[PDB]
């Protein structure tokens, strides 16, 4: 396969980003519930997927992101 | 259980002495994952012929053929033992004056206490056996107070 999601959205980004400088790209990285849109339905390679995920999870720990978001 | 096997003891002690007119000195059962092994020592006369075991076994088996309150079927061990007997009482030694006995006495020789001799006469605690050890003949008075274990032995 395999079961990742769309790429080439980095037409104005890449290869490594951001970590936090655009809350709006992170709005599209994963879900808004605090839960994580998986790498299955996010897409970028496990290197970049993992780095973006740890960025967003830090933002959670950084209060830039809610750990869990309510409704 | 033990009460059950005792009940079988009384019910089947009737046959034994209306059949071969033997007496069971006991019935005991050992088991190893199957029909247990009820060793019934049948007595009557001491020198029980094998036939006197075959016929007696026939009698007892037929007796219990229709009699088995114990739900499962089991091995009947019909035993017609010989004179060989553990000598705990003095009379046990007195009867055995004819046959050899071996005893384990508080004063051993060479580490272990067990020694066999052939009785010549009965002398209370004292022993006048023709005890034969290492092909040695002698009448050695083995004190019963020393004797920690004593059994009448085979005649060979």
């Amino acid at each position: 396969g395999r079961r990742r999601k769309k790429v080439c959205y980095f037409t104005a980004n890449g290869i490594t980003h951001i970590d936090y400088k655009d809350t709006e790209l992170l709005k599209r990285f994963i879900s808004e519930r605090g839960k994580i849109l998986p790498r299955r339905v996010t897409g970028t390679s496990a290197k970049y997927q993992r780095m973006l995920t740890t960025a967003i999870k830090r933002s959670r720990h950084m209060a830039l992101l809610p750990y869990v978001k309510e409704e | 259980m033990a009460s059950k096997i005792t009940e079988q003891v009384e019910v089947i002690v009737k046959p034994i002495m209306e059949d071969l007119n033997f007496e069971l000195v006991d019935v005991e059962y050992v088991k190893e994952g199957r029909d247990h092994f009820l060793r019934i020592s049948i007595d009557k006369e001491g020198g029980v012929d094998l036939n006197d075991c075959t016929l007696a076994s026939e009698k007892i088996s037929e007796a219990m053929d229709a009699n088995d309150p114990i739900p499962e079927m089991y091995y009947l061990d019909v035993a017609s033992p010989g004179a060989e007997r553990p000598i705990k009482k003095e009379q046990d030694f007195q009867n055995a004056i004819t046959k050899p006995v071996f005893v384990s006495l508080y004063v051993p020789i060479e580490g272990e206490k067990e020694w066999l001799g052939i009785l010549q006469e009965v002398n209370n605690e004292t022993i006048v056996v023709q005890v034969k050890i290492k092909a040695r003949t002698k009448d050695i008075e083995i004190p019963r107070d020393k004797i920690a274990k004593a059994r009448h032995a085979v005649m060979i």
Binding site: - | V48, L50, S57, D77, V78, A79, S80, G82, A83, M155
Partner: protein, 135 residues
């Protein structure tokens, strides 16, 4: 295995143990020295005789006896065969044999030559059963 570890090893077989503990006289009657005598026969007495019962359907009542041979080592042994004239403490010859009757025993008496006399009415005992040619 690798050649070197093959060298530093014997590649031991799975050598068995004789399931017949036939330790015949050897040094029993001097020094009581244990000795692996393989004799096909020792003389000796069955001090006691008995009869365990088989289960159904074949109620083929088999009879046992505990015996001492020249080494005088205790064993409860079954008697095969039809007919006998021996009793408690009769001298008997026991051959090695394990049959389907009862565990805890791997030997068997022989008929014809000793206190457990065979029967000369059949013809199978023509060369065996201890009994002579039925003449």
């Amino acid at each position: 295995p690798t050649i070197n570890q093959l060298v530093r090893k014997p590649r031991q077989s799975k050598i068995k143990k004789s399931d017949s503990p036939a330790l015949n006289k050897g040094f029993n009657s001097k020094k009581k020295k244990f000795t692996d005598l393989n004799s096909p026969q020792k003389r000796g007495v069955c001090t006691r005789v008995g009869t365990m019962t088989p289960r159904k359907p074949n109620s083929a009542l088999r009879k046992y006896a505990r015996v001492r041979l020249s080494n005088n080592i205790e064993i409860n042994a079954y008697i095969p065969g039809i007919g006998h004239n021996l009793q408690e403490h009769s001298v008997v010859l026991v051959r090695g044999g394990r049959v389907r009757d009862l565990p805890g025993v791997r030997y068997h008496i022989v008929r014809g030559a000793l206190d457990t006399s065979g029967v000369d009415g059949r013809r199978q005992g023509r060369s065996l059963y201890g009994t002579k040619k039925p003449k």
